[PDB]
């Protein structure tokens, strides 16, 4: 049951302000296709979100 963790991580990725819809769909589909990897995929989304922060 990575079920709660999967939905939790999907929700967070959805709310990342610096990602576009293509990038959000990439990570959210990744999660639902490999829930066991929920944590690692969430971390990667956050690193991508920070790299795309305004300067």
């Amino acid at each position: 049951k990575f079920n709660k963790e999967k939905t939790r991580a999907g929700a967070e990725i959805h709310s990342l302000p610096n990602l576009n819809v293509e990038q959000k769909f990439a990570f959210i589909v990744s999660l639902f296709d490999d829930p066991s990897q929920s944590a690692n995929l969430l971390a990667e989304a956050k690193k991508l979100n920070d790299a795309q922060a305004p300067k």
Binding site: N18, L19, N20, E22, Q23, A51, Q52, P54, K55
Partner: protein
């Protein structure tokens, strides 16, 4: 990183993805054009074009990409807010050791008008050296 330390306008695209989208845009390019990373990553660079852009020029770029070769041209581009600028533009593919195309590099130099003679020679030298720097910086990606 060395790619981030390159203080020039450039983008890098991936022709192996449908419609050849931008996968990296320099800090200078984004601030010059008034776009953000979230806005233009994943987009074909043709969004820079508009009403006063010369169609035959854009055709030369199309053809060079089809043939997988270099090209250097000048054409009218627009910022996000709609301000015009001349772009001295150079394109060139990055290849692996077997010659297969991995990415295209594009380097921009802004002007207020079409340049020729020595002014153009200098600009071309600057952008071509930059492209070689970019190719060297990204050769493991």
């Amino acid at each position: 990183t060395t790619l981030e330390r390159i203080e020039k306008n450039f983008v890098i695209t991936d022709p192996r993805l449908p419609d050849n989208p931008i996968i990296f845009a320099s800090d200078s390019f984004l601030q010059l054009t008034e776009y953000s990373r979230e806005e233009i990553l994943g987009r074909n660079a043709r969004f820079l074009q508009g009403p006063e852009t010369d169609r035959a020029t854009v055709r030369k770029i199309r053809d060079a990409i089809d043939n997988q070769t270099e090209v250097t041209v000048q054409l009218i581009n627009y910022t996000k807010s709609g301000k015009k600028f001349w772009n001295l533009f150079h394109l060139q593919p990055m290849r692996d050791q077997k010659g297969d195309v991995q990415y295209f590099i594009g380097v921009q130099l802004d002007g207020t008008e079409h340049v020729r003679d020595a002014a153009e020679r200098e600009g071309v030298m600057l952008i071509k050296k930059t492209a070689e720097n970019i190719d060297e910086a990204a050769k493991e990606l």
